[model samples]
Target: IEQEGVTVASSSHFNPDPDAETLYKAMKGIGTNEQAIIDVLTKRSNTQRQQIAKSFKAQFGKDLTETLKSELSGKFERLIVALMYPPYRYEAKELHDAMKGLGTKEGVIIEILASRTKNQLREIMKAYEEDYGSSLEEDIQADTSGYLERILVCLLQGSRDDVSSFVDPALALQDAQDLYAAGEKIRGTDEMKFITILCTRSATHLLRVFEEYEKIANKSIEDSIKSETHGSLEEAMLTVVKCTQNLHSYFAERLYYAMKGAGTRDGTLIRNIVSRSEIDLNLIKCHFKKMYGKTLSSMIMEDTSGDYKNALLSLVGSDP
Candidate 1:
């Protein structure tokens, strides 16, 4: 199988950094040299992070997780650790971490799962096995219940083979008919049909279906999702709708919402920008133009302040 559209380059790959050993030792011993670690770690890809984790343990005779526990704290540590795991493992960790103790971080699960590519998601499923010794699907079934769990289980199955950039219109029409029949006609808005089609359908098929749905229902899928659901479920379905139309626009719109308030929603802003920087922000940049007629970078610079502003700008500017 071919991995068609994944990024494999690392910042460390471009700039050889032999001082990682010395830096790791200093960071661990003194405990204030986090910048040193971040400087190196942030530059690394998931592949490189795995290598660093292995090297950190081999050199120190202690595992990277134990070493990190000794030094890092708060959301920053979580983000760094997330960067280190294989992408899939990192996602599983994200889901596990976000929903571990009490309340579920439904937003985290939605965003991560919705935006991830099939290949990347497949890796995450594998990583879940390697890291947690459990199937990702089984774990979701275990940790979460109710509507959220049901939706996640479908998402964890990854996209259907019938859905993609090169889907057959006939199959899409068939699927659309099934979706309409299941949701609108027989069951009066089947949540399963909504979740499965929204989460699993290919962008290509979805694009075609959007038009078909409009013709059949006299409105777009967006209107249907809005009319059918509310809260996180609505938000999740909306993501799929927008992603189908134009993914970049979808992300650009996300950035808009993230920075729309009187005060910047820094957590949302930072996570969306930083996490997406390495994925497909450039396409999103274009989408921002189509949807909002303003550049995502300009919007960030306008709404944010000081170092935070600069960091965000850099993130949008930086190619993943």
Candidate 2:
């Protein structure tokens, strides 16, 4: 499982100072050298990239990202700048940006909120406050309302039970019954009941609950959730279930739909590719091929072009 990462481990001959200098040189001259910038940033892991940022500031008075900000331009610049942020910071930035103005990027907000673990979820909240000197919880309340707002607030608590080594059979079955009474067995669905149960249960415990649910309802828990809710609340609840079952599969669909549309969903493509590259992109890449019968790498090339294409291709790597 550890070896599933596509990035070369830090144990190898990896040095941040040299990478910083390489990036500095890439940004030099009358105009930017696009490929030179792509080669270094796209190859390094986020941890290593953070180190390079440190090294860049140490070697030169100016920060690495500031230099790149001025030197690079267009969507390519945005993509590379994204690579520069630490994971927690990036997630925070994405969330803050999502809630910044008149309209919210509901999908972006929910995707990050649903997908993160306890630690990541907490870190993102902290990072958001650290970045903006404001509360992420209050920000959620500010931008959203109704059942969508309520469920998102529950997730924002970052208090889901662990994937315990031992799950209780009786407890799991009882929770399944509780869920059935709240949603499937009821006419309109008890939104709070679904929120409390789903948001609080352990993943392993939920796995058992889902199994018991199928036995009782003669339908999968996923199918039941779909039937119970609608709109953003529905999307949020389903994401929690899917991610609990198979995180990479959920992400694979995000990538698939990103390119499947009439035009590429560039933000989704950039975020998923860059962030997941060192984590489970290899798994997502495998999932992409199996589910879509096409390569993520190949789809990337077809959807985007020029320096942006080169950078993403380097990060995602070629197909297995």
Candidate 3:
């Protein structure tokens, strides 16, 4: 499967002009087969997407993305158009669109921050700089404030858990010490301490720290978070905890929620699947079936249609 935001191209890969009359008609013509464009472009990785963009300009003298925006609309169209650009830029666009209009989209902010790789976030930050000539951090600060801004800034800085270590009693103890110091002694919002622990620490180390934190704090972190914060801020912080505890199981729960109620929540489905695919999506997929008693793909298949369905299914189709 193509990595999220990273394109894979071989000699056999097709490359039609992004601006060719044929391509334009496919995108804009009456009864244009949007699925065909999605099939070809969505399958290409981010690198391949960039190549396609470049090839379009070289061959047709018009920007590929410009043509796409002119043709597509709505959240569905937004996601498809995003896939047509470079990965980082695509992510930046995601962030920009999510935050640009109306009240702050706390869900988008948290989902994006919670799931992206450090490098991927950095690339998105770079893309923001290129497109708007402003730092993503600046935008976050200007548009958001208080605890939401604080946590989002930390997430934006890419300084979450550092859990890449083997299980070790001593190291676990030290992390416990850091957690105690940050949360209790400093009178910090256990939220920030929890965010740092989950983002920067490895899973193994986090497993240990979770135990150690409970032992030291006398209550589990989840309880502490619930007692301390509210709304999406609290939820985002808890998500970082959920990721540390059992990343897949957490996502499984998310998938369950997505499929809950009258029908699938399209916004929730696209955001969660797309954001998670780049990071722990494999684990998320595993947890999805284990927790829900059905595979993630099975749920998606029953819930969605068209290219959106195809693009998402392709990612969760295989184990990472």
Candidate 4:
């Protein structure tokens, strides 16, 4: 429960007037000063950036977000725009985009819903309604079907136990046995039982359940999931389990895959880093180094180029 690492910090000496002026100057001329934009924006937290947005529009009579959108392009533009959103709004935008068009981007849904804390999910739902004037749940329900939809709806309800204050060893054991019965010991997997225990339990209790599950089932719970489940449902279950066990490491693995293989998943890379940058990104960075034997900064440098790379590296708190 100790968040030992987070890269972004509230600016103790935040001054929106100067920041707005600097950003305006950066974008005012014939050519955009990309470094100045990065320097001003990346150094401030999202809350500070919001203030800058307000101050920018008030002072210059121009929309700061529009200016950035017009001035920057590609991934760099995306990152800068992401910086302007408050966290909940950013997540709202992400969820909205995930379910927006033809076929749900189920991966985005799973990643955001499964990885976020219950409270975070609640705020996102609120932001979704406030910003888009539509229900996140209804959009999700419309976009998905079967177990994936069920699990996502369950998560959106924000019913997970707050296990921070206490953990029950006996309850953990019972949940483990229940999970075993639902999966490996039964002819057909009880998807509801899996959903109930995984979605509702506290991360602390779930860790204990996973340990007890391994002893009772004689295999890792992840192995059981792989054998019993299929497709996005399986992925959703696995993500919840991994996040409960080690949130940082789960994200580390995510970052690895984002940058690995033939092409970079720019959306995943940007989302993970931007979202976690102020939360547990430093811890994610540590796990990334331990898992990959290379720094994430170096990985970004290798995979991306130009201002996009610079902006990512700035958020990552790494020298290029």
List model 4 lDDT by residue over 1-320, tens digit each.
Answer: 11111235544566789999999998886888899998888877777777888999999999999988888899889888877778788889988988777778899999999888778888888999999999999989988998888889998887554546267988989988887776635534587788888887777777888899999989999987877678889999999988877889999999999989799999998888888877788788888898888899988889999999988877888532
Candidate 1: residue pairs that collide: 88-124, 248-284, 249-287
- Could you tell me how far off, in angstroms, the CA of residue 264 lies in candidate 4 after the best superposition? 0.7
Off by over 4 Å in 4: 1-9, 161-165, 183-189
Minimal lDDT window, size 10, model 3: 1-10
Candidate 3's C-alpha lDDT?
0.67
Candidate 1 vs 4: which has more lDDT: 4
- What tens-digit string does per-residue lDDT give for candidate 1 at 198-266? 766777777888777777767667777776678887877887676666666666777788777676655
Tally clashes: model 4: 0
In model 2, the runs with Cα more than 4 Å from the true position are: 1-6, 9-14, 161-165, 183-189
TM-score of 1: 0.72
Worst-scoring 10-residue span by lDDT in model 4? 1-10
lDDT of 3 by residue, 22-55 (tens): 4655865476676666656656655566666777
| lDDT against the true structure, each candidate | 0.63, 0.82, 0.67, 0.83
Candidate 1 deviation (Cα RMSD): 4.9
Q: What is candidate 2's CA lDDT for residue 113? A: 88
CA lDDT, candidate 2, residue 73:
79
